[PDB]
Amino acid sequence: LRRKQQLGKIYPEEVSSYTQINPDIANDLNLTFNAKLLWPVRGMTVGAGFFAFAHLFNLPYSFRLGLFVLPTAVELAFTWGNKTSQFKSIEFMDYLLQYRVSKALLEKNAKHFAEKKAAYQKEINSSQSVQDLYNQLITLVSEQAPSE
Amino acid sequence: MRTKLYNAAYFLLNNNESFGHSFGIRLKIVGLNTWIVGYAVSRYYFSSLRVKAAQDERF
Ligand SMILES: CCCCCCCCCCCCCCCCCC(=O)OC[C@H](COP(=O)([O-])OCC(O)COP(=O)([O-])OC[C@@H](COC(=O)CCCCCCCCCCCCCCCCC)OC(=O)CCCCCCCCCCCCCCCCC)OC(=O)CCCCCCCCCCCCCCCCC
Ligand SMILES: COC1=C(OC)C(=O)C(C/C=C(\C)CC/C=C(\C)CC/C=C(\C)CC/C=C(\C)CC/C=C(\C)CC/C=C(\C)CC/C=C(\C)CCC=C(C)C)=C(C)C1=O
Ligand SMILES: CCCCCCCCCCCCCCCCCC(=O)OC[C@H](COP(=O)(O)OCCN)OC(=O)CCCCCCCCCCCCCCCCC
Structure with missing residues (x-):
């Protein structure tokens, strides 16, 4: 609840982003x-299959109604609860909060970096981040540069 | 073969004190056990519920 309150609302774009x-x-x-109401569609499909089986073999209707309920009950039991999904949701919400904060920082300083960005795009043809390139450069200096 | 049928006794017997006295005890015990099991199931069910989501939220 605390993390979701801080995030407020979640849009499908961020979910698809974290899908990685x-x-x-x-x-x-x-x-x-x-978010949305979940129907045990797999359970209902299995129930319909059992219904077709019973219809073929001429079972009483009580048996097929029970065999429709049972797979539905199994699907519901295996769906709800599942507190591990809450841990995964917490992880995703932490990721999303960090991403949103960084995105806000990007937007806030976008005008300040317009000129530097224009100069940079014309000199570096790579789209890799500045942090990664600078770490690689630091390693390159630490390896090849003469200590002197 | 036309299957035979019967008239269920409890549908046509005048209500008696013995039925009441015994089925009262049986129903007392049934109610106790059913109440305990149903309370357990209710706690499980309510704890199984999801957390409230935002307004007009997808995923
Ligand atoms: C025929 C048709 C009938 C249709 C009926 C339709 C009914 C619809 C019900 C809808 C849901 C209601 C839920 C109420 C929850 C109450 C608790 C609560 O607020 O918890 C907050 C709850 C969180 O719960 P929690 O705190 O984690 O734990 C709750 C537990 O109950 C634990 O909380 P607790 O620790 O506070 O518990 C209190 C304690 C209290 O216990 C006691 O101390 C017992 C005291 C009993 C006193 C009774 C006195 C009566 C007097 C009799 C006098 C007779 C005199 C005679 C004289 C004769 C002449 C001498 O325990 C109980 O309450 C016992 C509960 C266990 C029940 C056991 C029996 C189960 C099986 C039988 C069920 C009934 C079958 C009837 C069949 C009828 C056939 C004809 O969260 C909420 O805020 C939810 C609020 C409720 C809404 C939930 C909505 C869910 C929707 C799901 C989707 C599907 C809905 C389908 C609807 C269909 C409609 C038709
Ligand atoms: C013990 O041995 C025995 C047997 O076993 C071998 C038998 O088979 C038998 C015979 C058995 C049979 C005939 C069995 C077949 C028949 C059956 C099962 C019919 C009985 C069915 C049932 C008991 C189930 C249906 C009943 C229920 C679900 C009960 C529901 C009760 C409810 C909702 C409570 C209603 C009352 C209220 C809400 C109270 C309202 C008033 C108030 C709250 C007061 C106001 C309060 C305030 C605070 C202002 C006997 C006699 C026997 O003795
Ligand atoms: C006395 C003898 C019998 C005793 C039996 C004892 C049984 C014990 C069972 C133990 C296991 C309990 C499992 C509980 C799972 C509950 C799932 C459920 O329905 O939860 C409600 C859920 C919505 O909950 P939630 O998303 O959390 O939203 C509220 C949050 N504040 O609701 C939803 O999301 C709604 C969609 C899911 C539910 C679909 C149900 C389909 C039912 C199909 C019935 C088909 C047969 C019809 C027969 C009649 C035909 C005329």
Whole structure:
């Protein structure tokens, strides 16, 4: 609750962004927050399959209604709860908060860096970050540069 | 073969004190156990619920 309050609201773009490290982020973020109503579609499909089986083999309707409920019950039991999804949601929300803070810093100083950015794009043809390039440069200096 | 049928006794017997006295005890015990099990299931169910989400939120 505390982390979600700080974030406020989550948009699908950020979820798809974090999909890189957790492909099941949507499947986990649905089981933590009351976003949308979840129907046990897999359970209902298995129930319909059992219904077709019973219809073929002429079972009483009580049996097929019970065999429709049962897979649905299993799906619901395996869906709800699942507090591990809450841990994964916490991790995603931490990532999202850091990303949003950095994005706000980007927007705040965008005008200040316009000129430097224009100068930089014309000299470096790489899109890699400045931090990574500078760490690589520091390692290159530490290795090849003569101590003298 | 036409299957035979019967008239369930409890549908046509005048209510008696013995039925009441015994089924009262049986229902007392049934209620106790059902209440305990249902309380356990209720705690489990409510704790299984998700956390409240924002307004008009996807994922
Ligand atoms: C025929 C049709 C009938 C239709 C009925 C429809 C009913 C719809 C119900 C909807 C849900 C209601 C939930 C109420 C929750 C109450 C607790 C609460 O507020 O918790 C907050 C709850 C968090 O819960 P929690 O704190 O974690 O734990 C709650 C626990 O209950 C633990 O909390 P606690 O520790 O405070 O517990 C208090 C303590 C209290 O216990 C006691 O001390 C017992 C005291 C009993 C006193 C009774 C006195 C009666 C007097 C009798 C006198 C007779 C005299 C006769 C005289 C004769 C002449 C001599 O324990 C209990 O309350 C016992 C509960 C266990 C029940 C056991 C039995 C279960 C099986 C039987 C069920 C009934 C079957 C009826 C069949 C009828 C057939 C005809 O969160 C909320 O804020 C939720 C609020 C509630 C809304 C939830 C909505 C969920 C929606 C889900 C989607 C599907 C909905 C479908 C709806 C369908 C409608 C048709
Ligand atoms: C013990 O041995 C025995 C047997 O076993 C071998 C038997 O089989 C039998 C015979 C067995 C049978 C006939 C079994 C077949 C018949 C059956 C099961 C029919 C009975 C069915 C049931 C008991 C289940 C249905 C009943 C319920 C779910 C109960 C529900 C009760 C509810 C909702 C409570 C209603 C009351 C209220 C809400 C109270 C309202 C008033 C107030 C709150 C007061 C106001 C309060 C304030 C604060 C202002 C006997 C007699 C026996 O003795
Ligand atoms: C006395 C003998 C019998 C005793 C039985 C005892 C059973 C014990 C069971 C133990 C396991 C308990 C598991 C509990 C899972 C509960 C899931 C559930 O429905 O939760 C409610 C959920 C919404 O909850 P949530 O997203 O958290 O939102 C509120 C947050 N504040 O709701 C939803 O998201 C709604 C969608 C999911 C539920 C779908 C249900 C489909 C049911 C299909 C029935 C088909 C058969 C119909 C038969 C009649 C036909 C005429």
